[PDB]
Each structure stands twice: as structure tokens, then as C-alpha cells.
């Protein structure tokens, strides 16, 4: 998760060009990992 | 938990940067990941560490602002509204 | 390390200040503030995490006073938010709210209203919780303003073309308001408001009894007693209003007769009011053998018990007996009697002193001429 | 009013005033007026004549609508499903979620109501109500709370009363919804349901709901309340159960701009001249072009883009750069970060072909720009995302432009633009 | 009009009215042989299918049997197994016109019985 | 509501010549405000019987 969040950090660095599809894949992976680690059950 | 603050701040910037070229479905997961990372750090990330006053104002105006909401039409749809509310609630609950 | 509450307070005060210029939606703002300040089950005793300032509350009340599209969900959010604001540490917030005329305007809007006219148990309970919190927060410091606020609200609702008179608004919530008011202490309440509410309520109930519908249709389940029936729904509301009048006429008056005290009583002022007494007596005269007529009988009995002298009670009765329909005169015009009204007159004439005064005031000649 | 207006200006002034303000006449950077399909249709009818369009232009209408396009595009997020929904689907009309929920009552003595949640309703002539509630003589309301496993976008609530004995149908129904499943909120005042064989409560605005509390009022003429079935219809955020664009998107402004540009050809130029200057207009129009259908078909957006890009050389070069190099906008400023640079579609290929092969003073420069993008791309290959990932379709479009302009006998020196150095660059690229 | 009501479980309404799609009210005028002091009006809806019960009932009374006069605004009757409309003040009536509103959720109005209860001036039926 | 609708239907068949502009403008203003309030203040839920087939107020070109 440290490395995945560093990757997301680097991908979002342009906000602070964005690769939105790559960001989407990374965000979905990070969400799946974090939820494995109730209000969000709708997702 | 400084790198976590960095990534959460950039996620909030991403939320604030979403326009018609961005999509609500991704916004739901961005909000979920923001909330989860904020609540996963040992010293939980507080909303004040993530946003500044203009950024928080824009975030809340996405939920309640009339330039982003038109009554029955809400910014990002009902799911985006619910996800933003849940993310804010989760961050504050982790703080409190 | 730093708390986010100050920042949220700044942002939410800015948002509430944005309501008037229509930059923020009231419903979503209230929902968001309720969600974020409840920390998640709502409870009327919760202190909000996010504290609004006096300007925010004043703007909220102003917007609500003019807000045209206030649906029931909006009203429930409003009531819950007002409750939690009364729980805020700002002068207490409850004092600011009750001292604000916009609060009376807002509650009048709420209570003035294929959907049922009701608001349902949840909205009614939210209104009760808000009023209870106002009462609790003002009890130890200044409950007279809360009681005055309740009486002013009931007066506005009872005045001609008001919610009660026009049969408008949620009946369940109106009845709940009356039930709540009946449990309040009305000491140190100005006599002007007390007399205004008594006058409006007596006029309202007289209109209700005289304007009763020609037909009557109840389901077999329904077994209530009609308003025009003594010694045994809008009837419940009218009966609760009469109960309130009964409570009010018993209030001792202050030395200068301008406020309820805490040996004269509001009953003396009511008896000295010819229009109020005429309305009550004619209303009871339109009744027949607890209902609305029972409420009128109770009010009249209380007035007789609290009258400073038997003459005070006898004068309205003799005035009523000396005129016909709606105070008319004429050779063959005589006042309307009823079994409840006759029973009340007999109770007033139960003592030797009352009978002596009745004789001294021409009562015997009046009744004999009336019989002929 | 438009027909009886003394002059078209009388009708246009209120319309332009409305278009120049936000909600309830508000101002603000991202505030823009509410459009609707009927209102847009009316505006188009008012702008149906050349005189009306001329007045609209003279009164700043074109600039107003273009600025509104850019601003509204900034102020909305696309609710159309994207690759996140595609990924959710890859990971495995409305749908009844009542069967998945658990139904309870606040009255301890109530009969279990799980039978109400069953997807299959009982027989229409079922002589005994599937579920019954006996009212105490002092009870006015009986409550049934259906908790769902997860929050859903609730759209309708169906309650089937016992059809054999309608006297037991609730007299009214108060629906409360809880998004979090804890804090119930009444949707509206109770719905009168006596005399109804079927109770369908449609939410005008779908609400996120993890719990639904139905408070059913005692029947008018019965002490027992009989129900057959309760359905909670709606959608999920994702999955199989997750099944007015002008009102919710910026597309209405683009439809207005297209009408201005195309309705009266003789005015096109003027309109284009009024529309070209506005900042980030081409980026916004390209973003709307590459977005999923939102009330405007691709050909009209392409016509708008081509007519703006062709009204002067500078704008044509900007459009070429937007399509090939950088389509992002040049907290209130437009961003348009959401799309990869240089992505190609039938629309982009057609626009680029028309820009390259349209004969006018700027054509050479446009071709030049195209060729530059080629060489730069090749150069980047020999070692900005639009350069790193040139669309094969866009390269083939440049090739077709060159071929057909050579076969069209253009009025500029096409061969001079195709120098040997570019040819060697392309040869090395292809051999790599 | 029959004095004996049908069986409470009678499966077919004793009388039915089919509403045209544009019809809101169906009227039934009961003329009496002579004027009576009308006190109550009983309407029995088809208990088996209460969806066909009228949504509301407007009662008009004619003492002379020619000029009908509404007693009051229509009484809401949907959800009622029995419709008892009591006149607070008994009215002289030689004709009674019941205007029954189309049911909320049905195109047919089903009734079982109508009773016009009251007294005569004289005779056996003449029983504050 | 029945009597109000009947009144409006009757009024729609009348001739409004030589009517003062003050009253005409007053009625137009009040009616436009009323209808705007009606459309903006629409209920959150919608419950109709199966028999009912009317078109919602916020629906055009039916």
C-alpha cells in the first residue's frame, strides 16, 4: 500500500498532465486493497 | 504520516478539479479512498490538514452550492453527493 | 494535531450567510450541517460539533420566514437543526431564537401547511422536541418569554383567517402544539397577550360551534362525541384551546394588572369583557346534553369560581338573558337557552349570595318576562 | 410573447438577461442559468429568423452562450458512466431491492413482515392478507422499517394492499428515507391511500436510501391493516442492478451555438467571429465532442468545431493543437483535465480532414501545423502525451489530407512543405 | 332500494355503474311517494370489492322533489365499508339525489343498498 | 378546486376588450408568480392511482 499510494501521489502530482485512466485503475486497486484491510458498501 | 497527507491533499485537489471531462463514478472511489486513507493513518488526517479555507468552501458548495446544484439536479448526482457527504463525515469522525 | 472544528465553523457560517443571496440551498445545507455536527444517530440533546454564530441563526430564520418552497423533508431538517442550535453555545441560542419574530413566522408557516393535511408522527415529534428544547433551555433563566412566545403563536394561529380558523395546516402538529402548551407555566406573562389569546380562542370556538356542518358522516370505528354535546380531529384542537383558556383565566394578576403573578385573576378581565362572555355564553347555549361544550362549561365554571364577586359573573349572564339572537332586541326575541347553559346558570345561582345578587339585578323579573 | 413583441429586441432582452445570471438572478464565477429542453427549444424558435439572430449577436448573445458553455462545463461533473463503471462490471427497468432487506416493526407484538419483502406477490384473490397489523384502540400509525444490505438509489416504493379486503388498506402512508439507515427523514406529507388497489409512491428525485420506514395510518373503517407486498424499486451505484441532458449538462449552450452558426448560413461568419475569441471555447467544445452522448449528436459538435476553426488561421491552428497536442484548458478556471491528449475518433478524424483539405488562406499554415505535429511525433519517437502517442488514425488522416490535396490542385505549394528531412524522419520512424 | 341488504359476502355488486373516461360523478335520484323528515342516508358499498366504493358522496335533498339542493360538500367515502350520512337537522325531503364520485382506483362503482331513514309527519312511521 | 376550474374555464371564453391595463398586468403578474411557485414548489414524491394518467406539470410536448 505504501508503494501504491506513492504511485497515486506521483500520478496526481500534476494537480499540485493527468493520466486519468491510469489514475482510475490505481484508485480502484487501492480501494479494493483498503476495503480489505459499512457506509461505503454501496460501492 | 506525511506522505499520506500528500496523497490525500492531491486526492482532494482531484475532487476539486473534476469537471465535465471527469466522471462521477470515479469520484465515488476517489471519495472512498480519501476517507479510508485519512482514517488509516495512526494520527488520523484531519480535514484541516487536507484543505484550506477556499478549498473547504468549494468542497461544501459542491454539496450545497446553487452554482453546482439546481434543486432536483445535484452535482455529480445523488451518488456523488452521498459519497462526498460520507467522505467528510468519515474524516471528521476519525478526527473526533 | 490541529482541530478542524474552527475551520468548519468559519465555512458553515459563511455558507449560512450565503443563504439570503441564494448561493446555498437551504435543504442541502441543513442536511450537511446535521450530518457533520452529529458525532451518528440524531438526538434532541446533542451539542453540534459545528457551532454557528448569531448572524448565521438570524439569516437562517430570515430565509425560513421568506422561504417559499418548504416541503415536509425541509421542515423536518429545519426542526432538527433548530433543536440542535438551541443546544449550541453561542445570550443563549434559545433566547435568540424565541426573541426573534422570525421564529414565530416560521412556526406559523409550518403549522399553517392527494396528500393528508397531517405531517406524520416524525415531523410532529420533531416539532415537539424543538419546543421541549426551547422550554428546557429557557426554563432556568427566562421561561416567561417562552410562554409568551407560545401564546403569541397560538393567537396568530387562532386569529381570524388563521390556520385554526380556516382548518389549514397539519392537525396532528397543531394538536401536539396545544398539548405541549397546556403543560407550560404561564406566570409573569403579559395580560395583553393572555387576553388576546383568550379573545381569539373564544371567537374561534364560537365560530366552530355555530358554523358546524349540516351533515355528519363517521366511520363505524369512529366513536367520538360531537362538539355540541356536554356531560358525555378538529374537535380535539378546539377542546385543547378551551383547556388553554381555562388554564389562562385562572392565572393570578400582578399588582398593576399587566402580567400574571408569580388576589385578582385573569377571570375578572374575561368577565369584564362583554364580547368574550357573550361568545362563550351563546356557544354554550348552542350545545346540548370531554367535548368542546364540556370545555366551555369548564371555562364558565372556572370564571364563576375565580370571579372577584358574584356580580361579576352574574352581569354577563343577565346581559345574555336580556337579549335575543346575537344581542338582538325585539318584543318576542329571547336568548337561546340550553341544558348545559341552564345547568351552569343554576350552579352560579347555587348560593344564597348569588341568588340575592340575581334578585337585586332584576334577574327574577327578567326570567319571568322571558318565560312569558 | 415572441410573436406579439413589437421588436425582436423586446423578446431577446429578457432571454439574454436570464442567460446572463444564475439561480434566482445570482452572480458568481461558476453560476450559470438553468436550461431545459423546452426553454432551449423556445430560444431556438426565437432565434429562428435572420433578424432575431442578428439582434442576438448585436446584444452579445454569442459571447454570452460561449462563456456559459465554458463556465457550465467547469461547474459540472459527467454522470455518464466511464471506465470505472466498466471495471466494476468486469469485476461482476428499475430493480426491486425489498427481497434483500430485513423488515422490522416498532411494535413488539407485530406479526413478522418478511412475507411482504418476497419478490413474488401473493395471488390477487388471496383471501388472507399476507401480513396483518392489529391496531390498539389508541394507535394511529403502524411502522415498518425495511433495512437494505447497502444503500441504493431509491426511485419508487410499491405497497400492495390485501386486495380481497380493501377496508384494511392503510388510509395514508408516510414514507421516511434514511441514506445512512439510522436517521429517518420523511420524504413528504403522508400520501392518501384509502381506496387504492395499488400504492405506487414515486420519488421525483431519486434518494440514496439504506433504510425505508413506511408509517401506515390506521384504515378509515377497520382496526386491522392488511398488506400483501412491499417493493423498494431503484438502482445500485454499480453492478447489474445499476441500470433532460440540457438541464444537467452544458450541452444546451453548444446546441445554441450550433444553431447560431448553422441556422442562417449567411450569418455563420459573423457568429463564428463572435464565438472564436472566447477563452477555452475550443477546448470545451472538443471535450463535449469526445464525451458520451449528452443530448447533442456528434455531427453538430463537429460542425461547430470546424466552423469556428475555419473562421481564422490562428483558431484553426489552436484547434489542431487541441485535437493533436494539448486539449486541456488554457478554482473557477476551466480545467478539462479529464481526457488524454491526442485521442482520435471518427469526429476528430473528420474535423482534421476538413481543416487540412478546406481551401482558404489558412490552409497552408494548417497543413504546416499538421506536418509539424508529424515531425515532432517522429522526433519524440526517435528518443507531450499527444506526441508520445500519436493516433494512427490521425497520422493516416494527415496522409489522406496530403494525398487528396495533391490530387485537388491546391493554391499553395504543397510539395514544398513535404521536404526530404521529414521523409527521412518518417522512414526512420517506420523502420523503428 | 330493497329493505333487505344482500349477503355481506355477495361476490357481485347489487348495482354497478360503468364510468365513461370523462365522467367524474354518477347520480342516483330516489323519489319518495310523499315528503318525509329525512334524518339519515345509508349507502352500502359492495363489501367484496371496496375499490369500487365511491370516493365521495354529495347528497342533495328536495323537499318538493323538483329543486334539489346540496346538503353539504361531498363526504369522503373511500375506504368506508358503510356510508352513514346523518343530517344534524332533519330535512323535509320528497327526493334525494346521491351524486357518487368515481372511485379513486376503479372505473366501476358498485353499491349494495341505499336506505333513506327518517320519519313521517303522521302514521306509524312518525315515531334539548 | 372544481368551482375554481369552472371559473377559469368560464373566464377563458370571455372577451377582454376595453379592460384596464392595470388589472390585466396585475392578473398576469400574480398568475406568473403563482405558476412559478407551483413549478418550483412541487412535491418530492408522486403517488397516482392506476386510473390516473395525467401528465406532470413539469413535462412539455406531451
Curated annotation (Swiss-Prot), chain B:
The BIR domain is essential for its anti-apoptotic function and is important for binding to DIABLO/SMAC and caspases. Belongs to the BIRC6 family. This is Dual E2 ubiquitin-conjugating enzyme/E3 ubiquitin-protein ligase BIRC6. Homodimer; antiparallel. Interacts with RNF41. Interacts with DIABLO/SMAC, likely with higher affinity to SMAC dimer than SMAC monomer; this interaction blocks the substrate-binding site and inhibits the caspase inhibition activity of BIRC6. Interacts with KIF23/MKLP1, USP8/UBPY, BIRC5/survivin, MAP2K1/MEK1, RAB8A/RAB8, RAB11A/RAB11, PLK1, EXOC3/SEC6 and EXOC4/SEC8. Anti-apoptotic protein known as inhibitor of apoptosis (IAP) which can regulate cell death by controlling caspases and by acting as an E3 ubiquitin-protein ligase. Unlike most IAPs, does not contain a RING domain and it is not a RING-type E3 ligase. Instead acts as a dual E2/E3 enzyme that combines ubiquitin conjugating (E2) and ubiquitin ligase (E3) activities in a single polypeptide. Ubiquitination is mediated by a non-canonical E1 ubiquitin activating enzyme UBA6. It comes from Homo sapiens (Human). Ubiquitinated; mediated by RNF41 E3 ligase and leads to proteasomal degradation, impairing inhibition of apoptosis. Deubiquitinated by USP8/UBPY. Autoubiquitinated; mediated by E1 ubiquitin activating enzyme UBA6. It is found in: Golgi apparatus, trans-Golgi network membrane; Endosome; Cytoplasm, Cytoskeleton, Spindle pole; Cytoplasm, Cytoskeleton, Microtubule organizing center, Centrosome. Expressed in brain cancer cells. The lineage of its organism: Eukaryota, Metazoa, Chordata, Craniata, Vertebrata.
